[PDB]
Design a protein around this ligand. Structure first.
Ligand code: HEM
Ligand SMILES: [Sm+3]
Ligand SMILES: [Zn+2]
Ligand SMILES: [Zn+2]
Ligand SMILES: [Zn+2]
Length: 172
C-alpha cells in the first residue's frame, strides 16, 4: 500500500474525495437488459482478462477509473458475470485514454491507490470482494471500497476518514 495524489486534494479526506468522484461519475448502469457498449468497460491484456479494467462515466462522458493488478473475468461461466483475481490498484481521474496497443491511462489524475492486495476467487463470485469493489464503483457506490480501505488503514492507525496528506506520511 501507497498513495499518489494531485496536490489539490492534499487535505481532503478519502471519504470526501471518493464521495465527490462518485457524485459526478454516477451509476454507469450495468444491469440485465441495459448492458450495452457504453457501460461496457473493456480490459487490456485480453477480452475478459488483463492487468487493467477501466470504464468511464456514461453521464458526463469524461471522469473515470481504472483498476489494476490481475483481473480475470467470467462472463457466463459459473458464476455468472463476476470479476475476480488480484485487484492491485485503483486510480481516479478525468479523461480516460489509451488501452489497446498500449495500456489505459488517465489524462488528468485526481488520486490513485497502490497495493490493495485484494484477492477474490471465482468460487466466491458475485458476493466476493474485488468483484464488489469494482462493481460498486461502476454503479457509483464507494462503500465497498472505503470498507476495504479502512481495512488497509486499520493496521495503520488511520481510516478513509483522514486526509490524503495524513495517510501519506504514515506510508512513505
Ligand atoms: C469486471 C467488471 C464487470 C463486472 C464486475 C460485471 C458485472 C456484471 C453484473 C453484476 C451484471 C449483472 C446484470 C444483472 O444481472 O442485473 C453485468 C451484466 C452484464 N455484463 Fe458484466 N460485468 C463487468 C464486465 C463485463 C464485460 C467486460 C462485458 C462486456 C460487454 C460485460 C457484459 C455484460 C452483459 C451484457 C451483461 C448482461 C447479461 C444479462 O442480460 O443477463 N460485463 N455484468
Ligand atoms: Sm486489517
Ligand atoms: Zn489539479
Ligand atoms: Zn474531478
Ligand atoms: Zn473534473
Amino acid at each position: 500500500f501507497s498513495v499518489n495524489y494531485d496536490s489539490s486534494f492534499g487535505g481532503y479526506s478519502i471519504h470526501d474525495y471518493l464521495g465527490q468522484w462518485a457524485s459526478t461519475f454516477g451509476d454507469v448502469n450495468h444491469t440485465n437488459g441495459n448492458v450495452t457498449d457504453a457501460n461496457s468497460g473493456g480490459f487490456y491484456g485480453g477480452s475478459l482478462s488483463g492487468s487493467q479494467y477501466a470504464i468511464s462515466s456514461t453521464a458526463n462522458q469524461v471522469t473515470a477509473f481504472v483498476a489494476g493488478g490481475n483481473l480475470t473475468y467470467t462472463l457466463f461461466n459459473e458464476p455468472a458475470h463476476t470479476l475476480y483475481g488480484q485487484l492491485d490498484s485503483l486510480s481516479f481521474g478525468d479523461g480516460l485514454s489509451g488501452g489497446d496497443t498500449s495500456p489505459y491511462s488517465i489524462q488528468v489524475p485526481d488520486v490513485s491507490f497502490g497495493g490493495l492486495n485484494l484477492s477474490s476467487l471465482q468460487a466466491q463470485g458475485h458476493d466476493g470482494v474485488v468483484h464488489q469493489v469494482v462493481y460498486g464503483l461502476m454503479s457509483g457506490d464507494t462503500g465497498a471500497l472505503e470498507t476495504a480501505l479502512n481495512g488497509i488503514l486499520d493496521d495503520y492507525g488511520l481510516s478513509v476518514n483522514s486526509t490524503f496528506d495524513q495517510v501519506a506520511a504514515a506510508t512513505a
